[PDB]
Design a protein around this ligand. Sequence first.
Ligand SMILES: Cc1cc2nc3c(=O)[nH]c(=O)nc-3n(C[C@H](O)[C@H](O)[C@H](O)COP(=O)(O)O)c2cc1C
Ligand code: SF4
Lengths: 56, 429
Amino acid sequence: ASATRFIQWLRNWASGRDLQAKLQLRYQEISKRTQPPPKLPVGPSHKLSNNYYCTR
Amino acid sequence: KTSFGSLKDEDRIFTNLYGRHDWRLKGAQSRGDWYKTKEILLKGPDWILGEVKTSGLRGRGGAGFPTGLKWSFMNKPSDGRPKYLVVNADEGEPGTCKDREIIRHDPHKLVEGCLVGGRAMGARAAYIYIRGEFYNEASNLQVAIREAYEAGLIGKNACGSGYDFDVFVVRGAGAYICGEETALIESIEGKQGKPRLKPPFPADVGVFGCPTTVANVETVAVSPTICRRGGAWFASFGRERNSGTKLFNISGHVNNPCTVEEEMSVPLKELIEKHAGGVTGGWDNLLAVIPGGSSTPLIPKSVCETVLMDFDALIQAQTGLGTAAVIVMDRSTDIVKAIARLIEFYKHESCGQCTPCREGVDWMNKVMARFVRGDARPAEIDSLWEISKQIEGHTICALGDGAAWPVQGLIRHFRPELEERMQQFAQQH
Ligand SMILES: Cc1cc2nc3c(=O)[nH]c(=O)nc-3n(C[C@H](O)[C@H](O)[C@H](O)COP(=O)(O)O)c2cc1C
Ligand code: SF4
């Protein structure tokens, strides 16, 4: 991210691409390393009736 | 006949139901008891069983099984064991108090019924199992039995017929389950009142391991009159397969709760207003009725409008006649709390022997307690329905069924009340 403008032009010209738009090094676009807690769903057998195991 | 329920006094069987005449031997004889008892005994068991059959009498203990056919299981050659009649006077079904009146006001009808019913079965003695709370009632019965012994009506050469018959009175110690026929027998034998599996049936292996018939007090007490007046007379009351007269207990929210004898198949509304003085606050204030003791499902007002009181009619109404103990609930009743208390009753009475009732009934009681407060979710109603179906038909005895049915009745007719309570509780929390 911190390359000088001249160096950006040189490696863009040498590679023939716009490297700056798809840098292989990750910066702040990635997800936070602390996330809010999940609340995961339950499957279709989580029922209080009409759920006899011999039918599934 | 299409209408039933204007029974005349001359057609009534328990003519001292209210204890306004001498309940002792002199009064009982003056009212027709013990009359021509020798002739009945000399006719033979087949004649007596024939009369009981043609009367269409059915069990008055709550299950309504044909009495004549049931009593015929005992008509067989002796195999060396004594034969016994056990008369069920345990009277534990909530709402039911009919057998209490017979025992204390018409004891000699019960004693004579024991001799006549015992003769047909070939029994040597009758054991009358009366609940232990009925202490004064039991003492009246013992006084009457002593009178019959001293007049030769029972004992050796009963009524001069050459038939030896003894009548014993055995008191319980406080267990509703001991009304169940096999639990009653185990109780007489000095064990816990825990029912037996069937087979063997009591007519083969019963009290003390001997051939036995268990009969309700009311079923026994009417047998002498059916023999004297004939089965055809009895069968002229009520619908086909619903014959005879019946003792009814009308308790709950009625102006004049009472016990009364009325014809089988009388309309429920006709019974409540002709005898009990109507519903408290009028017929429009009626919410629901338990038509046959705590074990029969409740029915709402709409069904109560035209339902008849007999085994077939109430079955079609998705309930049962049971003991014919009518409990009335008006619109001011907390219907959920009323049924929950019955489930609490069955929780206290379950003998604990078998898994679905020992665990299931206590489970149903816990769920009903939360349903009273609304502290549940609507999905739990179908869960509770399914739980009750896992108890019904999977237990040793019918107490498990008698606990499931009241729950099923409430969900059947009062689901929106259950769901409304849940909404209130959720809205307030
Ligand atoms: C929990 C339970 C309690 C019962 N209590 C009585 C009772 O108190 N009196 C009675 O006659 N039958 C009672 N029964 C029914 C008896 O098991 C039996 O069916 C009846 O006494 C048979 O007599 P019957 O054919 O003359 O009705 C009870 C059944 C159960 C399952
Ligand atoms: S159903 Fe209940 S009362 Fe009947 S045997 Fe089982 S545990 Fe005992």
